[PDB]
Amino acid sequence: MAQFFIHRPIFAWVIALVIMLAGILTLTKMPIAQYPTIAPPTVTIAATY
Amino acid sequence: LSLEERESGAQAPFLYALSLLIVFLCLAALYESWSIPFSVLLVVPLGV
Amino acid sequence: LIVALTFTPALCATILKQHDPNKEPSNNIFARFFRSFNNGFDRMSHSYQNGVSRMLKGKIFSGVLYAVVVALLVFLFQKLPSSFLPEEDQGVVMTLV
Numbered sequence: 736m737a738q739f740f741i742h743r744p745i746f747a748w749v750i751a752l753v754i755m756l757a758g759i760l761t762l763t764k765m766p767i768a769q770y771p772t773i774a775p776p777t778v779t780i781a782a783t784y
Numbered sequence: 785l786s787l788e789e790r791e792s793g794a795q796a797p798f799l800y801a802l803s804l805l806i807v808f809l810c811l812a813a814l815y816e817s818w819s820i821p822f823s824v825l826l827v828v829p830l831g832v
Numbered sequence: 833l834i835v836a837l838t839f840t841p842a843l844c845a846t847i848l849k850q851h852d853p854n855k856e857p858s859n860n861i862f863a864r865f866f867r868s869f870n871n872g873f874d875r876m877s878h879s880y881q882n883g884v885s886r887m888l889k890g891k892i893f894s895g896v897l898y899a900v901v902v903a904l905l906v907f908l909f910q911k912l913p914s915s916f917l918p919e920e921d922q923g924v925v926m927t928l929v
């Protein structure tokens with residue numbers, strides 16, 4: 736496999752470029768936060784007498 | 785649909801260019817050369 | 833790992849150039865800084881090998897150093913205080929009255 740690409744450098748360049756292209760496209764629509772969603776659910780009940 | 789209308793139209797052209805670049809890359813990998821893929825890309829108008 | 837097996841062999845085949853003969857000596861200020869560094873690392877490697885031999889023949893020294901490091905590791909893991917998440921300066925203050 737390494738031997739396979741030693742002779743097809745253009746093919747390896749294409750693989751690298753495709754990877755990079757996918758990630759550049761991914762970043763444009765990626766959400767940015769401070770932390771991931773981490774708070775657990777909380778349900779509160781209220782009643783009056 | 786009036787609210788939806790605005791977003792739909794603008795994005796379309798960009799995907800064609802994106803597609804064209806990927807087609808070129810896959811062709812270049814297939815032919816082990818950066819040149820020949822042009823001979824293929826040039827036929828695109830013939831279809832349309 | 834994927835990159836190392838696909839991209840980097842290709843670049844090693846294409847970007848590196850073959851010239852390690854006797855023909856080419858070179859003098860430059862930058863060149864001097866690398867020849868000195870190579871000599872230093874050769875000295876370091878020889879010293880490392882000699883130390884490895886002398887640690888091999890000395891079992892007591894090795895075992896003692898090893899034991900000491902483990903003991904200090906245990907003691908320090910006891911002594912270090914704990915916490916959850918560091919406190920930041922988020923630019924707001926809340927007062928309770």
Ligand SMILES: CCCCCCCCCCCCCCCCCC(=O)OC[C@H](COP(=O)(O)OCCN)OC(=O)CCCCCCCCCCCCCCCCC
Nearest residue numbers: 748751752755756758759760761762763764765766767768
């Ligand atoms: C010794 C010199 C070596 C230097 C090497 C340089 C570093 C290489 C590493 C590249 C990886 C960069 C990863 C970036 C992550 C940034 C995280 C982040 O906070 O995202 C912010 C932002 C996304 O949010 P937003 O502000 O909405 O922008 C998107 C719409 N424009 O992000 C964005 O705006 C979108 C970002 C898109 C990513 C651009 C990637 C640049 C790739 C450059 C590589 C070129 C390599 C040469 C290849 C040879 C080709 C022949």
